[PDB]
Design a binder for this molecule. Sequence first.
Ligand SMILES: C#CCCCn1c(C)nc2c(N)ncnc21
Ligand SMILES: C#CCCCn1c(C)nc2c(N)ncnc21
Ligand SMILES: C#CCCCn1c(C)nc2c(N)ncnc21
Ligand SMILES: C#CCCCn1c(C)nc2c(N)ncnc21
Lengths: 261, 261, 261, 261
Amino acid sequence: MKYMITSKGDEKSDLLRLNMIAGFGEYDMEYDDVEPEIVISIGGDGTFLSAFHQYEERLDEIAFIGIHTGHLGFYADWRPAEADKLVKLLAKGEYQKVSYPLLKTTVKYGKEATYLALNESTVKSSGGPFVVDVVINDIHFERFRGDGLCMSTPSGTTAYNKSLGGALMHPSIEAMQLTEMASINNRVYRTIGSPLVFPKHHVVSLQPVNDKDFQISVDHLSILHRDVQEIRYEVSAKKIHFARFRSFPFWRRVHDSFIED
Amino acid sequence: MKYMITSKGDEKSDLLRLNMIAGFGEYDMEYDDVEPEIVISIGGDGTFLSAFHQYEERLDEIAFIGIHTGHLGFYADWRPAEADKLVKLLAKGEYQKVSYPLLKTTVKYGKEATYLALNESTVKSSGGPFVVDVVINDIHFERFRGDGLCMSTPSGTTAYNKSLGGALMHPSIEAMQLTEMASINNRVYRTIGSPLVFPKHHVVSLQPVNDKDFQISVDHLSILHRDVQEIRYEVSAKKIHFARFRSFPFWRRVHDSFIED
Amino acid sequence: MKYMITSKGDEKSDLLRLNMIAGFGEYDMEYDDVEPEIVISIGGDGTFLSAFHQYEERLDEIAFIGIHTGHLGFYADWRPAEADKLVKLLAKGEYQKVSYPLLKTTVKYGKEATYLALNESTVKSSGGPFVVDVVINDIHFERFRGDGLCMSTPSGTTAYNKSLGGALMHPSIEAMQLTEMASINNRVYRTIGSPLVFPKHHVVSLQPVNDKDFQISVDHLSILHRDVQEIRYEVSAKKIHFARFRSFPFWRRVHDSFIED
Amino acid sequence: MKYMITSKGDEKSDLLRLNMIAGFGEYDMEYDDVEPEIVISIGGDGTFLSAFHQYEERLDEIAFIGIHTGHLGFYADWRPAEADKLVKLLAKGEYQKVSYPLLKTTVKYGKEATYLALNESTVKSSGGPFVVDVVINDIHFERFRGDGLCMSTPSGTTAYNKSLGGALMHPSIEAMQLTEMASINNRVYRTIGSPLVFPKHHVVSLQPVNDKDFQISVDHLSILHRDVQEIRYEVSAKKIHFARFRSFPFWRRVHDSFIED
Ligand SMILES: C#CCCCn1c(C)nc2c(N)ncnc21
Ligand SMILES: C#CCCCn1c(C)nc2c(N)ncnc21
Ligand SMILES: C#CCCCn1c(C)nc2c(N)ncnc21
Ligand SMILES: C#CCCCn1c(C)nc2c(N)ncnc21
């Protein structure tokens, strides 16, 4: 089928990419970076994120693969020594696929932009103090005052969400998790503190109180949005599809990354 | 139908119980504390827990109701001023039901005991240091050294789980959450730190390394178990059924309990 | 003696300022905002901070006073209803003074700037990832990777330091406290996690590893510094002097601000 | 002078103890475990704690030494390969001493017991819920509801205090640090959350509200106290004296124990 390979760009990932292309040349495989069915990422999880956002409009037609040339990644979870075995099994097909949930972010102005996040989406203020009203399913839940907020996907829980005290969730759970950054809590100002885990169809809305400019990030992309009336979080109806070439359990990936080896 | 009412025992809950019984006497309702179909709890969440464990073997045949005579509870979430309205709508029937997931705990010795938890189940040592090997789906994940561990249901996340830094999960998510109590982390000893959220069919196993006696709690009940080979956590196949007499969203219950009013 | 009064600027603080000036006109008191011996702040703690930094070069010759027209402040800890009593006792003199420690921040480039902080000084990256080597008394302690770091004074511990999990320290302790913002900790990257409390004469040095541009804050002032070789923290030899007109213990100020009333 | 050596009891520490005794036999040194001036601990920090509590009534007349036969300890911070060099320099004398602060715990009943802690002192309930009123310098600060409380010395901050989120304090600071264990915080119940650092002469008092039986620990010793009216914490007037045979900075000891090597 049609495939493409993206590379981190260093000497090591480029040479592995050229070898896989040559290995694919021995099969009924066509290189196409416009309408690929297999997207192979060689480098790290950041390389995988760029590959994901590069083709975030053909997600239902693409199975992703990650190869880590550095340390183990949660998306780039296959070693370079398995590149030849990957070429063989991807060419035969007959492989199984696994799907992870995604986060949908909607930004409304006074004009509405939607984004797809594989890891998380964060909101901070542009200079001044960050104060937003948190609305859960049209119910005002809290007035947050602090550095910012982070809404994470299940597979994104091991990234920025973990550094903010959030829980690690198995990516088979269709949910999103909201965590706080340095919240102010006193007699006057009150936040829940705890991370919040939301199922599908639950809508979390952030609404400004004074300043209406925010620095909004979606995975690696961070942009200053001006004159926004609402930031809207929801579990996406779209999923990212991975090609499953053997068993590498998520909890083992968590152990190998944070505990040992 | 058949019903029963449990009371916290104070003058206030007993008098409300007698008034509801008399109110039920005006309908085709029979008081039966042996095979009830409606279990009404009057008092607090602790009163509701005892009602749950009192009938934990007829869960598929019982719809529970909680009335709080003190502060708002997450299970006793109806005010005493609505007792007359509750009697009317429970007698007519035609009410909808909602179901929350439960936690199954299995204790094995050298002889195996199973327990059902509505909030959480905790493990600590009996005197000496608490060290266990944490096994996730037959994969050794970590060697935990600390005060203990807590596995919580979704509706139990607002209880002891919250005090340990765990996330608040919407009870429509079929999952369990493991949190740590005062873990030792240094160059030699390593724990994940973060709370872990597990879906259905995932089995978390605790296995002793030296001392084989542990103080195991299930909701309010705490017992010393001796000569245990394994503690086994899993999302239960059973659910607790609530009678739904109006809309009181979980996130609103969280706001009313921790934020304001 | 010579005095001056700074105001938050709202109608309420300005009118209280004019009344105290008129009240001071009934005593041997001279208004002088160039070489004052008494600096009275009317507004909030932010108003007090600006008054402090306005006269941070005559600290050994000034006794500060804070009056809060809004909620209770840790520096503006006197109510407006006591303004007349403050005028009387400040004019007589004979009042006792109390001193709080300060934080000295030194920034070195490739050209060296020193700053005095009453609350805290923070360091973050300008866009890219924030990675610094933490050096304690010329000993390399850790390579920090995360959002940033915060070094707080004792009286500053109740401000941003508290939101980052730092401890509240009694301001009679001559020390500084370093806290982390969203640190990355895995098998490869290691931070201490815990807040660190340093005595006098201890020097904490932050040294860049790649990017040499950082957003450095000192209390309310936040500036982008380019081409910095070292950020250097130390407990200042200077102290801020408060005029003590009655007993308002720090721990009571903490209780009134975070617990109740 | 007079000396004694305590051993962890394993084959390795006993043989090192016999070799140091024989090495001391080549000098004007007398073994005396009743009135020693030098107390050498061989094993771990737990071995050092027992040596400290064994002679906690001759603290002003004893210089302590710790040798770790296992991993590095914060009190047993000298390797076995330096035992011969330690014998030489302890026999000559002329060594410098360093002193660490200690924690004084007073327990009052309806009859008053005082204890000296090198690491920390903790309070928990005996079975039932743990609720105490926290009184700081005769001012009611908070009503604590949770698992328990921990008051730590500066050198004890790297032990249980660290596992509870407390800050690491340099042991030259004469202070104590109070940390919370799993506190309940909601609309009804309020705790400060943050760790609290107290200077000398500050008295922290714990007073019961209902149950008057508590499990009180002092370092390794844990005892059930019944019918207690007050638990009283204060920085001790006594200090523990270490013999200083070279420079091993506390922050380096922290790095070697938690960061690397
Ligand atoms: C650059 C950088 C730091 C984050 C790396 N990273 C990414 C891009 N995704 C993940 C993930 N799912 N889990 C852990 N780590 C991750
Ligand atoms: C007694 C006592 C303290 C816990 C009260 N409590 C119970 C029994 N369940 C819950 C719950 N689901 N959420 C919050 N709080 C709860
Ligand atoms: C604006 C704003 C938020 C911080 C207010 N604030 C200041 C300026 N100092 C302190 C302080 N020492 N303790 C608590 N809060 C403080
Ligand atoms: C047994 C056991 C666990 C604690 C060991 N330990 C002791 C006895 N003191 C300390 C200390 N000052 N810093 C770190 N760790 C310590």
